[PDB]
Design an enzyme around this catalytic site. Structure first.
Site, mmCIF file in Angstrom:
data_model
loop_
_atom_site.group_PDB
_atom_site.id
_atom_site.type_symbol
_atom_site.label_atom_id
_atom_site.label_comp_id
_atom_site.label_asym_id
_atom_site.label_seq_id
_atom_site.Cartn_x
_atom_site.Cartn_y
_atom_site.Cartn_z
ATOM 1 N N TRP A 19 -16.226 -1.519 7.540
ATOM 2 C CA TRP A 19 -15.725 -0.209 7.160
ATOM 3 C C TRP A 19 -15.546 0.632 8.389
ATOM 4 C CZ3 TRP A 19 -14.389 -1.468 2.661
ATOM 5 C CH2 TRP A 19 -15.197 -2.326 1.896
ATOM 6 N N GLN A 21 2.138 5.739 -10.709
ATOM 7 C CA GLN A 21 1.379 5.037 -11.734
ATOM 8 C C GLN A 21 0.784 6.008 -12.766
ATOM 9 O OE1 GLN A 21 1.549 2.512 -13.370
ATOM 10 N NE2 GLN A 21 0.876 1.037 -11.809
ATOM 11 N N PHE A 22 1.606 6.502 -13.684
ATOM 12 C CA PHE A 22 1.131 7.496 -14.650
ATOM 13 C C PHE A 22 0.073 6.926 -15.600
ATOM 14 C CE2 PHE A 22 4.727 5.715 -17.088
ATOM 15 C CZ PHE A 22 4.090 5.460 -18.306
ATOM 16 N N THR A 23 0.096 5.606 -15.789
ATOM 17 C CA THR A 23 -0.855 4.923 -16.671
ATOM 18 C C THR A 23 -2.300 5.191 -16.271
ATOM 19 O OG1 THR A 23 -0.840 2.867 -15.384
ATOM 20 C CG2 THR A 23 0.821 3.129 -17.102
#
Ligand SMILES: O=S([O-])[O-]
Ligand SMILES: O=S([O-])[O-]
Lengths: 152, 152
Positions: free
Chosen positions: B65, B81-83
Site C-alpha cells: 500500500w 454506474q448508477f446501479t
C-alpha cells in the site's frame, strides 16, 4: 459485512504457481468483506441477497430474474480490502476487517450455506488469503453494493 | 457519490454496434465504477477524484500500500454506474431513486472526467459510453476492491 456484486458473462480465477483453479460462465462475482463484529445473521443476509437479487432482464421485463432463476453460477471471493479505510489518508487501513483466522472459518461456513441454499455445483470460490488473478467479463456492467451494518 | 475502485492489470471496454466493438482500453491501473447521487456537489466529485488518483494501492518491492496510480504512471478507466444506488433493503428488485437523473448526471460525469485529466494526464484517463450497455473484460489484479461513499 460488505459485498460488491458484479454481473458477469464469465470469470476465470487463477493463483500463482499462474494457474486456473476456478471458473464460472454467466452469473455473479461477489467480493465479500467480513467485518470484525459480523454475526451469522450478517452472513445470511449477504447470501440471501446474492441468491435473490433480480439482476437480469427477461423478455419484456427488467431486473426480473435472479441468479437461481437462470440456473447461473456464483464466484465467491474474500475481499478484506473492502474495509480499507481511506477517510484519513491515502494509505488504506483495514482495522475493521475480521482477523484472518476467524474470517476464514466464517467464509467457509458462508460457502457451505451458499451451497445449501442453492446447489453444490453452482458455487465457485477463490483461494482465501492468496494473491489471485481474476479475468472477469463484466456484463453491463452491473455493480451492486451492500453493507449489512446499514440494516439491523 | 459512490465509487467501487478495482486494481487491474488491464481492462477492455466494448459497446454493441454479436455487435460488441472496443472503444476503450487500459493496461495496469484502476477501474472505477462511479455512481452519482441526486444531491452530489462538486465537493463530492473532488473527493472521489482525489481518492482515485492518490490511494496507495500498489506494493513497492519494499512496502505494501505504498504507490498510487500516478506514481506508477498507470491509467484509470472511469465508468458511470448508477446501479450503485440500487436500493435492495426492501425487496429483491433494486430501485435507483437516489441516482441523479441521467441528464444532469451526464454533465456532472463529463465535468468529472475533465477534472481527472486536469489533475493527472489527458492520455491516462479512459471512459465508457455513458448510459449505454457495455462489455468490460477486466483482469483483476489481487484483486483489490475499494469502496467509498462521500456521504460518509
Ligand atoms: O483504448 S483506447 O482508449 O486507446
Ligand atoms: O446500445 S446498447 O444500449 O444496447
Amino acid at each position: 459485512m460488505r459485498v460488491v456484486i458484479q454481473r458477469v458473462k464469465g470469470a476465470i480465477l487463477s493463483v500463482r504457481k499462474l494457474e486456473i483453479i476456478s471458473e464460472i460462465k454467466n452469473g455473479l462475482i461477489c467480493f465479500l468483506g467480513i467485518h470484525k463484529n459480523d454475526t451469522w445473521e450478517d452472513a445470511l443476509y449477504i447470501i440471501r441477497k446474492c441468491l435473490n437479487l433480480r439482476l437480469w432482464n427477461n423478455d419484456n421485463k427488467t431486473w426480473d430474474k435472479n441468479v437461481k432463476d437462470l440456473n447461473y453460477e456464483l464466484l465467491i471471493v474474500s475481499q478484506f480490502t473492502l474495509f480499507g479505510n481511506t477517510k484519513k489518508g491515502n494509505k488504506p487501513d483495514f482495522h475493521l476487517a475480521k482477523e484472518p483466522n476467524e474470517a476464514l472459518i466464517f467464509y467457509n461456513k458462508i460457502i457451505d450455506e451458499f451451497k445449501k441454499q442453492y446447489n453444490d455445483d453452482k458455487i465457485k470460490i477463490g483461494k482465501f488469503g492468496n494473491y489471485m488473478n481474476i479475468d472477469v467479463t463484466n456484463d453491463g456492467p452491473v455493480t451492486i453494493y451492500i453493507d449489512t451494518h446499514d440494516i439491523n
